[PDB]
Structure 1
């Protein structure tokens, strides 16, 4: 239905007047779960593609960008992250990146939709390999609700959500950020999908402003990824540790570590550069008017 004449087209009122389309090789899955519409297809040139409510979540070809950054930005900004919470991350990709750190002993994942877990294991095996980690404790539920049952529990919280629509709506609210503050340990750090500086600079400054009322350290970084709207996405980074410097990794990686972790996107120079914004965005977020 979103597939016509051998192409899938992604449209959304959050990025009006533009669309990415990916040519379809083979439909793999299309079924509605309790929470959302779940579409999976083998594309011609991007490998397998997961689509939720018409919005591309990942492709095999470029997923490593978002997966490595959302994991390593917060992890390399904590001097010893031992207990990690992931909210969302149904494809298993973030889990896969997180567990590569020896410091990490325990990762709890809270995913709302078990059908996403199932189709990922089947059609996104290079990402859902994450689910086979001995470091994982898996919960099926609303992350916003699960956050309330945890206080002072986590070194790092990662919110790997789709856009501020449907089941992910509340994950972008100031109330949810308060819940994360409470679920973090006294020196804990968070990283949430924070949207696109070429599309949502208003949301970005607004989130930044409310986060600054909750946390001593707030930062915005971004990464490039062909199949997200406008070809990139950002991350909201917050710490309860007043000493956190997100822009200079507290855990730099050697070239050998980058090689051993099989990283395709992230390294310490990339981490530094991710905070260097286009002048329009730097000005909007930092300068006074």
Structure 2
């Protein structure tokens, strides 16, 4: 009979609500408040510090686009790193690539992983894959200490207010750059084009200081504020990430629900007002 409502100073004057069928789990971890409920129409929902992280109904949009964009552009990715993303959605999509031989994930809050393993089985199933290696720690420290370099890095970031506050600066992007192969790619969750173009501009500024090609793409997802979210795309080659190099025809990919070859590049076709805001950058 009651409703969950998502408020935040990051999007003042607006809110999105889901009808709660039953509350499944709540706790205060070392790092944040965790809530899991079954919604009446979006299936199960994960909330962190009062911010919706995912729902069963639409998470495939975010996880597919964040993963298959960089992974269909990298020629033969062997070693992939996911920053954040304790829920495992990125990992699930990554395991689909039989040519990947190692997936490292760095998540600061193991509670997120554990909760996901219990309540979101079709999302966290990737954890059962032998290539997957979990590191419970601060992304900044992980990046400073790792000896390996990666073909792809996916910053499945979480909002700038909270634990992911540190994932939104100039020091962080150089660490990413150094952790990548010379032909390596990073994609990062970047805020909605409707809410904070100031943030998007800033992220693109930091990124261009290092990467030779920085592009921005948009994903339609109803349970993120304003119904969409961006992908900050960083490339070491000047070819960038707008055009896939391969088609996903293997039986592993026959279940995809959002991503395909055409909408990969389409996602980079932005509203006129945004294109205008993003140069002289």
TM-score, normalization: structure 2? 0.96
How many angstroms does 1:261 deviate by? Answer: 4.0
Q: Which moved more, 1:183-192 or 1:52-61?
A: 183-192
Q: Is 1:69 equivalent to 2:62 in the alignment?
A: no
For residues 213-252 of structure 1, what are the structure 2 equivalents within 5 Å? 213-240=209-236, 242-251=237-246
Q: What is the CA–CA distance in structure 2 between the aligned matches of 1:27 and 1:77, rounded to whole Å?
A: 40
> Any idea what the Cα deviations from partners look like across 1:192-241, whole Å, max 9, x if unmatched?
1011111111111111122111011111011000000000000111012x
> Any idea what the Cα deviations from partners look like across 1:164-206, whole Å, max 9, x if unmatched?
0111001111111110111111111101101111111111111
Indicate the residue corresponding to 1:280 in structure 2.
273
Q: Is 1:43 equivalent to 2:43 in the alignment?
A: no
| Structure 2: 5+ residue stretches without partners | none
Query: Is the Cα–Cα contact under 8 Å of residues 194 and 204 in structure 1 kept in the other structure?
Result: yes
Indicate the residue corresponding to 1:123 in structure 2.
119
For residues 1-289 of structure 1, what are the structure 2 equivalents within 5 Å? 6-151=2-147, 153-240=149-236, 242-251=237-246, 253=247, 256-257=249-250, 260-286=253-279, 288=280
How many angstroms does 1:244 deviate by? Answer: 2.9
Query: Is the Cα–Cα contact under 8 Å of residues 31 and 37 in structure 1 kept in the other structure?
Result: yes
> Any idea what the Cα deviations from partners look like across 1:130-182, whole Å, max 9, x if unmatched?
11112101111111110001255100011102110111001111111110111
Query: Is the Cα–Cα contact under 8 Å of residues 258 and 267 in structure 1 kept in the other structure?
Result: no
How many angstroms does 1:35 deviate by? Answer: 0.4
Q: What is the CA–CA distance in structure 1 between the aligned matches of 2:88 and 2:252, rounded to whole Å?
A: 21
Query: Is the Cα–Cα contact under 8 Å of residues 151 and 182 in structure 1 kept in the other structure?
Result: no
TM-score, normalization: structure 1? 0.94
| Number of residue equivalences | 281
Q: Could you list the structure 1 runs, at least 4 aligned residues long, displaced by more than 6 angstroms after superposition.
A: none
| Structure 1: 5+ residue stretches without partners | none
